Each structure stands twice: as structure tokens, then as C-alpha cells.
Design a protein around this ligand. Structure first.
Ligand SMILES: Nc1ncnc2c1ncn2[C@@H]1O[C@H](COP(=O)(O)OP(=O)(O)OP(=O)(O)O)[C@@H](O)[C@H]1O
Ligand SMILES: Nc1ncnc2c1ncn2[C@@H]1O[C@H](COP(=O)(O)OP(=O)(O)OP(=O)(O)O)[C@@H](O)[C@H]1O
Ligand SMILES: [Mg+2]
Ligand SMILES: [Mg+2]
Lengths: 90, 494, 503
């Protein structure tokens, strides 16, 4: 929705500063929020801003309730991210 | 949407946004900031050349944003800060505060021409008038629609002054009004007031689609009128000179079309057609001093002897400061000798205006060709009154009753006709006190005389002697009307 | 298709849809939601300027959609939400909360210059400024405001010839900034003056033109030849694009023309002289009569145009003479001024004479009136008259003007058992139809002829028929002021010997 997406957009710098969609594909797909093909397509992207744009869209759709993902930046040592988005979520 | 200011900036800083920039770079930052719709970024993102992506980014952008802040924002982050700095500087030299002359002239010249304005007279200008015209036009560029009546005697020089008043100052065209449309009327038929406005619209018409000009020749008045206003909306501050209006219908149309009009005319009353208060400027007979100036200006020798300044006061007397007939005089005084100047003085009498009729910048060989019309238009009853004014001495202030003697029909009715008569061609000279008196000048006098029935002159003279029975600056007293004999001199010459 | 509310919105919010919008942006979204055809998008998609793509998008759109919904949905998605928000606000101040639309969502969008654009294009003339009839221009505007709600209606601004009706419509649509923009979206002001039977069709040929876009005046066909059923059907079709459009029909003479207006379900202001043309409309007709200028209003009107004010007993009287003869006639009063060039009470009284010994022709002048003198106008008012009524009028000259006089006293000069009420019936038709007569029910049924209405007849009717009517009355005179001439004293019309000897 507008709140969730507005969050993926507001916290765009950090996501598009560090972060990597390859890192989340195995998890998100493990959560069934992603498809093998989805991961494959993203996995096969030359630059990261490409792999990032895709995931954001995917999250805004497939993972509208990216709550699960909100526990992913936790596990990935990128907790300074999942903490910011929980603030937005809050 | 960016305002003129904000759009004038994207345009001024355009030589730069072409040398180093790219709309693909900004699309993500705009879509991300909810500034670009998917299709927007598609449209600007798939473009072969960059001048395409740039022209679409600057077109699409000017519509979408409530302001210019985001543009600067992006220009910064993109290492193109030398750009976002220039634009922020420009927005500030407006937010915090409230060329070649000859080259510029060409624009003025073109404006004058395309509006079919003729060239202004140069060898001699009655500044006063040209000045006062321009002034009263400046006062009105504010107004939504208005009439200016530059009226005067036939050939008194009105049209030349409009040529000059729109040609001297560089403000009237460009500063006060955007464009000029100058159309000569001269309409007498009833189809003329429509034909005029057929050609007015043409002036407005683009250079394109003069080819497509239809058989507009056949289409109602309600439509030519509606058609014109449509085109009128396109042009702002469009001044209209209507050189030579005779029919009040022109004024009427001018007022249905909510036009801004300069108007040269001879008959002043056409203004009663317009309910709106109309301003007026009368082109008087050339004052005695202005006549000198006008003569010198065109190589004419100034007085040297008592009976030489007099030879020249004779021409001025006969011409009564008449621009047009004065000019005809010069074109004839080839010897340029006080002598051949006096030959004409005498000749003009024993032949009326026809003695000096010549090829002149005037459409007319002689002032008699002009006045013809001024006389045809006259009320059938008024055409009569004018015919009997010949008997009276010209250049003499004379009572109403002394006139009641020759004029057909309390005889105030005579006065009413004589007013209509000065109002409608400056044929007569009114003058309220000391006592209600009129006067006929020589130009007009000679004209009427030579024009009428050789009989009606002599009949009016006799019809006067009858009333002579009763029972100079100093107007003629009622104890001494019995003798019009003071002017025996100016009467025996019949 | 939509309607007047949904189309009035696309029109009100038009100053905006021009500054930021593009029909190319919406074509894909509408070929989709089932509102467009692949020629539709072709027609609006290949257009050089945007005002073209916009005028075609708003024309084509008003026909295609069952409602105004996807549009709102669109300006939302297109980052032009400041638009879809304005239009949804407007659609809401109509269904739920009525009334509030004009004060709230329409009033702010006023601008004097806009009116002038709209006035000029609707062929409205400029309003008189040097004097304004307060009362009337006000009451006109009022009764127009009360009706912007109505779907179709007639307003009859009826009065005597030159009585000043047309000028008031110029002012009533030019003073307030609401009538145009707030109450009605556009104006169409057309002068009728139709007498031929082709005139009522020719009128409506121009009405459609007055409607048609600046584009396709080129394509204007030989519409000159096409049935009445089609010009009529052809007009309403375009009318769609015209929400809250008002119609001034300056100078209707024909009731047939009156009709068409009611087949076309139009909203009409109507200036006319003959009031009965309204019987053509079964629709409720509301009326405003332009009376003769009251004695006080005449003063105001004179001063307004540099006319001196009475200074002496027999100077206020010099001026009561003009007002009497003029009987407060805007048009002939104006002709007076344009002629009263000296402006001196003296030359003002000179004319007061010229008027008795030359009728209206003594003061005929070039005036903002299409007419040299009020006689040129009244000509028509008299031609139209029932052949029998033309007769009745023609004999009224004998009667004293500005005198309240009984029906029987009239039965004496007027043509035609024992009850002559037929005289009264003619005299009513006579005031109804150009207002050439006065009427007064009680104390007793009496009529009256004014002076402007009198001098005209005096100078026009057969010099003989005047003298024949004078002799006729004498025979009937034999019989056996505020107070109506009593029946004990009719035998002597001699009270008015003064105003009778002058014949
Ligand atoms: N410098 C001048 N200023 C004024 N009049 C001039 C001047 N030079 C010449 N004239 C005379 O006036 C003629 C044109 O007169 P003009 O057209 O100004 O009068 P007008 O008021 O237009 O007359 P009309 O009544 O025909 O409209 C010239 O060709 C010449 O005869
Ligand atoms: N308020 C006014 N101010 C100035 N002049 C007026 C006014 N009202 C009427 N007149 C005079 O009447 C003339 C036009 O009259 P108007 O058209 O208003 O009357 P009307 O009732 O339309 O007559 P008709 O029905 O014949 O059109 C103007 O030229 C002016 O002389
Ligand atoms: Mg000229
Ligand atoms: Mg009118």
C-alpha cells in the first residue's frame, strides 16, 4: 500500500547505498515471497541498482507485508536497515 | 506547473542543459519522488538523441511540478552542481527583489508597415498635434476599447498626423500597443461598412491561410463579426487606425467589436453613434506663424518687403492655412519668386481652387474634388443653406439675422443648420459670444462659389438687398445692418 | 454521455486543464477502461497543438462515458492529482450538499477580465455607464440568479419602443460578476427583429454558429439549405458542450421565434415590445416591464449627461415640458440632448416648441439608437397590429394626451347591439402590444395616451382622418384631473378645449 511502499521509497538511500538482492533471494524465496525465476532474473542483473529496483517492486507487490523481510536485514548484519523501517512501520 | 519565471529559467539556462545533462539520470529521482509516471519515464527514456530526451524532460516537467525545487535538488546530487547553482541563483534574483538601437528600430519599422501604415511626413511636422495625439493614445492603452477622433477640415491634414503620431515615438507600438492595423474607409455604399471589416480581418489573418481565404465575400454580418473577434483574441493591444470614416456605421461596428480605434474623419457627429465617451482632437486651420514654418520648410522664400509679406499673407489668406491646397500651391510655384507667387494669388481668385490644382501627395488634384463628397452627404435641406453662404463676406464675423436673409426655410432654425454645417466638414466657423455669429473662410468660400449655379449667386445677392432695408474686430452693430455696404469691396467682385 | 453538471465541471475547471494536462497521457488509460475507439485515439493523438488535443478530448469525452469517474481516477495516477481532487470536490458539492457549489467551489474562480472575454464572444454589447437604471438592472439580475437552477425558462424584459430594454440587458450581464461564471457558464446574445417567415429559422442558424467552435467555421456547410427539424436537432447536439449557457434574444417580434426557444429547451432573456408573444410558451414566464422614466429619474438622467438643473419656477417648468413630451422616453430623451447643443435652458425650450410643431422629427438625431427618431421604430409596432387594431390606434389622436378618460368617451371615435366593450378589448391589445396606451382598472375602466405615443400618430395619420375623428366625436358628445371626468359632464369635452384648439 502507500504506507509500506512510501517506506521502501523514503529509506531509498541506505538500500541503494549498501544492500544486495542476491542476499535476500534465498530467504525471500524460502518465505515463498519470491519465485525461482524471480530470483534468477534478479540474480542475472549486471548492476545492483537494477537488482534493487526489481526487488523493491517485488516487495511492494509480492511482499506487501514485507514484515518477514523486516527480519531479513536483521539476520544479514544490515540491522541498521531493518531498524529504520520498523521505525517507519511504527 | 512552472510559472513564466520558472519556465524562463529552464529556457535561459538552456545553452548549458544541452552541453552536459541527461534525462535518464533524473527519471529515477523524479519517479522516486513521485514526479514521473511510468509512461512519462518510458517516453523520455526511449529516445534516440538526447536533445529529444531533454526537450521532452523540459516539456513534461513544466506541467507536472508545483515548483522548481526538485530540479535543483537533483542537479546537485548528480555532480552537475554547476547547474543547480545557476538556477538557484536565478530564482533568487527574483524571489528576494520586486539592444542595438538601430536593430531595435527595424522591429518598429516592420510593425508600422505590416499594419499598412504610411510613412510619416518629415520635411515639416506640426509637433503640437502629433504630440497631443500620441499623449491621448498613451493614456488609453490601459482601456479595453475606445475611440479617438482626429477630425478637422477637409484635407486639413488629419491623416498625415496619424502617420506621424505612430511613427515618431517608439512606445505607441511595442510598449503601449502590440500591433497596428491601419485601414482607409471612405465608404459610401451600404455594403462598404461590411467590406471594410472584411479587410480588417484580413489584416489580422496569418500570412499562412491567405491561400485558404474563402469566398468570405458571401457570409452574413453576424458571422464576419464573430469570425473577427475570434481572430482578435489572438492578437493583444491591436490599435486600429480607420483613416477616413464617412459613415457612422463604421463606428457602430467598431463598438460591437469592442475595438481600440484611432479615427480620421471630416464629419464629427459620426461619434454620436458610440455611447462610450469619445475623446477628440481637432485639426485646425494652420495658424499664421505655422504657415511661415511650413513655407520655409519647403524652400519657400520668406517676406522681404512690406508688400511682400503681404503677397504671402494673401496666400495664407486664401489658403486660410490649408495644408493640402497650400501644398498644391508650392508644387506650382516653380519659379519660387515672390512675383510668380503673387501671380497665383490673383489667379486663384479668378479661377477658384482650379487655378492651383496640381499633382500632389493628396489623392486629389484639388481641394474641390474632396469637398465634393462633404457636400453630397449633407442633409438635403443643409445642402441648400450652404449654397446661400456665398453671398456673405469671407473672413468676417457676421450675425445670425444678417444670415437669416439669404438662407431658405423666430429664425433660430438658421443657427441650427449653421452648426450642423460647421460640425460636418468644418464648412463654417461658429462663435458663441459676444453675439451668436458664424463665418465662412476663403477656401470654403471660393469652393462653394465656383461650384454653385451662376444664377443662384446673383439671386441670393438680390434676395439680400431686399432685407437691407429693415425699418473688423468690432462686430457689425444692429444700427448699421441696413448697410452691408462696408463690404462693398468684397461684393462688387460679382 | 454526461449532462449539464458533469459538463459544467469540465468547463469550470478549464482555466486549469490548459496549464497542465495532455490527452496523449489519458488515451491509453481510456482505450482501456472502455471509453475510446482506435480512431478516437488517432484523432486526438495526432494534433499539432495541445489545445486541439484538449478540446477534442473534452468534446469526444462528454459523449462516450456513462459518468465522470475514470477521469478522476486518472488525474490521480498521472501525478496531476491537484486536478482530480478539484473535480471530485465539485461533483460532491452538488449531490450531497446543494447550494454550496456557487459560494464555495465556483465563486473563487471569478475574474473581471474573464467576463469581458465571455461577454465579447457572446456578442454582448458594452453596458451604458454614464447613467444606470438602478432598480431595473438589479431586478433583472436577481430574477436571473433565481433561475440558473432551472433547466429552461423565459425572462421577458418587455417595454415601449426606445423605452430602454436592450440597454438594461447589456448592464444586467455586465455589472455583477456572477451571472457569467458563477450562475451561467457562457453567454449568447443575438438580435432578432425577424418579420419574414424565414427569419425564425435564420435566427437559429446563427444560434448554432454562435455555438460552434472557432475551429470548423471554415467547414461551415451550406447549412443555408437543410430542414428545420435538422437545424434544431443539429443545434442541441453541439449544445451538449455548453453547460449553463444563457441566451439573450434582443428584439423578438415573432411568437414563432418565441416557440423554437421552447422546443430547444433553452434558457432565454428576451427583450421585446409586444408582450403577448409569451402566450406561445406554456412554460412559466416571468416578466419585467420597462416603464416610462419616473419624474425623478429623468432629472438624474439629465444631470448625468451634463444637462443643467432647474433654477427658476419657469425653468423647472421648461424642463417639465421636455419630460412631459418625452414622457420619460430614454431614446427620444437622448436624441434631445444630442440636439440640445447650447445646453442653455433657452435652446432647451426652443426645442420644446419644435416638438409640438414638427412631432418627433424636430429632434431626430444621430444616436446610439439604430434609429434617427422614435418614429422609425414605432413604424413597425404599428404594421404588426391587427388590421382592425391599426384602425383603433389611428383614431386615438383626437383624445387628449396625459389625461385619464372613460371607455364610453372613447367609444365615440373608435370604429366597429348596445354594449361597446369591444372598444376596451382593442385598447388592451393596444397597451399589450408596444405599450401604445395606458390602462387603469378602477375607479372606472379608463385608458390614456401619452405624448410621445401621441405626437407620432398626430403627424403620421391622414391629415383628414384627424379632422374627421374630431367631427365624429362631436356627434356622440351630445348624449341625452385626479377625478375621472364624470358622466354628468361628458357633454363637454370642452375642458380640454386648450389641447383641442391646436388642431
Ligand atoms: N507635413 C505636412 N503636414 C500636414 N499636411 C501636409 C504636410 N505636407 C503636405 N500636406 C498636405 O496634406 C496632404 C494630405 O493631407 P491629409 O491626408 O493630411 O489631410 P486629411 O485630414 O487626411 O484629409 P481627408 O479629409 O482627405 O482625410 C498632403 O499630400 C499635402 O497636400
Ligand atoms: N440607461 C440608459 N443610458 C443611456 N441611454 C439610454 C439608456 N436606456 C435607453 N437609452 C437610449 O435608448 C437607446 C437604445 O435604447 P434601448 O435599445 O435601450 O431601448 P429598447 O427598449 O431596446 O428599444 P427596442 O426594444 O426598440 O430595442 C440608446 O441609444 C439611448 O439613446
Ligand atoms: Mg486621408
Ligand atoms: Mg436595441
Amino acid at each position: 500500500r502507500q504506507d509500506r511502499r512510501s517506506l521502501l521509497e523514503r529509506n531509498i538511500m541506505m538500500f541503494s547505498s549498501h544492500l544486495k538482492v542476491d542476499e535476500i533471494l534465498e530467504v525471500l524465496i524460502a518465505k515463498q515471497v519470491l519465485n525461482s525465476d524471480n530470483g534468477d532474473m534478479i540474480n542475472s542483473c549486471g548492476t545492483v541498482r537494477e537488482k534493487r529496483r526489481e526487488i523493491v517492486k517485488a516487495v511492494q507487490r509480492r511482499g506487501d507485508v514485507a514484515f518477514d523481510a523486516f527480519y531479513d536485514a536483521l539476520r544479514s548484519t544490515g540491522h541498521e536497515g531493518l531498524a529504520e523501517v520498523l521505525e517507519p512501520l511504527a | 506547473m512552472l510559472c513564466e519565471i520558472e519556465c524562463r529559467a529552464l529556457s535561459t539556462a538552456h545553452t548549458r542543459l544541452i552541453h552536459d545533462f541527461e534525462p535518464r539520470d533524473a527519471l529515477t529521482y523524479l519517479e522516486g519522488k513521485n514526479i514521473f509516471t511510468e509512461d512519462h519515464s518510458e517516453l523520455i527514456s526511449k529516445m534516440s538523441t538526447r536533445l529529444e530526451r531533454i526537450a521532452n524532460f523540459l516539456r513534461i516537467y513544466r506541467r507536472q511540478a508545483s515548483e522548481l525545487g526538485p530540479l535543483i535538488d537533483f542537479f546537485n546530487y548528480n555532480n552537475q552542481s554547476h547547474l543547480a547553482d545557476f538556477l538557484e541563483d536565478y530564482i533568487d534574483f527574483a524571489i528576494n527583489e520586486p539592444i542595438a538601437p538601430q536593430f531595435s528600430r527595424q522591429m518598429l519599422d516592420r510593425k508600422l508597415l505590416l499594419g499598412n501604415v504610411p510613412k510619416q511626413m518629415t520635411c515639416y511636422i506640426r509637433e503640437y498635434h502629433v504630440d497631443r495625439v500620441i499623449k491621448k493614445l498613451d493614456e488609453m492603452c490601459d482601456l479595453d476599447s475606445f475611440f479617438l477622433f482626429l477630425h478637422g477640415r477637409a484635407g486639413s491634414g488629419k491623416s498625415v498626423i496619424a502617420s506621424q503620431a505612430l511613427s515618431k515615438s517608439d512606445q505607441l507600438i511595442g510598449i503601449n500597443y502590440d500591433s497596428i492595423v491601419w485601414l482607409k474607409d471612405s465608404g459610401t455604399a451600404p455594403k462598404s461598412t461590411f467590406d471594410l471589416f472584411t479587410d480588417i480581418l484580413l489584416m489580422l489573418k496569418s500570412e499562412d491561410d491567405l491561400l485558404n481565404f474563402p469566398s468570405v465575400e458571401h457570409v452574413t454580418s453576424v458571422v464576419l463579426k464573430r469570425m473577427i473577434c475570434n481572430a482578435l483574441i489572438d492578437r493583444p493591444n491591436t490599435l486600429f487606425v480607420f483613416d477616413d470614416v464617412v459613415q457612422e456605421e463604421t463606428i457602430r461596428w467598431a463598438q460591437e467589436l469592442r475595438l481600440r480605434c484611432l479615427v480620421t474623419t471630416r464629419d464629427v457627429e459620426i461619434s454620436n453613434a458610440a455611447s462610450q465617451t469619445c475623446e477628440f482632437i481637432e485639426v485646425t486651420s494652420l495658424e499664421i506663424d505655422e504657415c511661415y514654418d511650413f513655407l520655409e520648410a519647403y524652400g519657400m522664400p520668406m517676406p522681404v518687403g512690406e508688400k511682400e509679406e503681404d503677397v504671402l499673407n494673401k496666400t495664407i489668406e486664401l489658403s486660410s492655412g490649408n495644408p493640402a491646397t497650400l501644398m498644391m500651391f508650392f508644387k506650382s510655384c516653380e519659379p519660387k519668386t515672390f512675383e510668380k507667387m503673387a501671380q497665383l494669388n490673383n489667379k486663384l481668385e479668378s479661377r477658384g481652387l482650379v487655378g492651383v490644382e496640381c499633382i500632389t501627395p493628396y489623392s486629389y488634384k484639388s481641394l474641390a474634388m474632396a469637398l465634393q463628397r462633404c457636400v453630397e452627404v449633407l442633409s438635403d435641406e443643409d445642402r441648400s443653406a450652404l449654397a446661400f453662404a456665398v453671398v456673405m463676406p469671407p473672413g468676417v464675423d457676421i450675425p445670425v439675422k444678417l444670415w437669416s436673409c439669404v438662407i431658405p426655410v423666430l429664425d433660430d432654425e438658421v443657427a441650427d443648420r449653421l452648426k450642423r454645417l460647421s460640425k460636418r466638414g468644418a464648412l463654417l466657423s461658429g462663435k458663441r459670444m459676444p453675439v451668436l455669429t458664424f463665418k465662412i473662410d476663403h477656401i470654403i468660400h471660393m469652393f462653394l462659389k465656383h461650384v454653385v449655379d451662376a444664377q443662384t449667386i446673383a439671386n441670393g445677392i438680390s434676395i439680400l438687398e431686399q432685407r437691407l432695408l429693415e425699418i473688423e474686430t468690432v462686430i457689425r452693430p444692429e444700427d448699421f445692418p441696413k448697410f452691408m455696404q462696408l463690404h462693398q469691396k468684397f461684393y462688387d467682385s460679382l
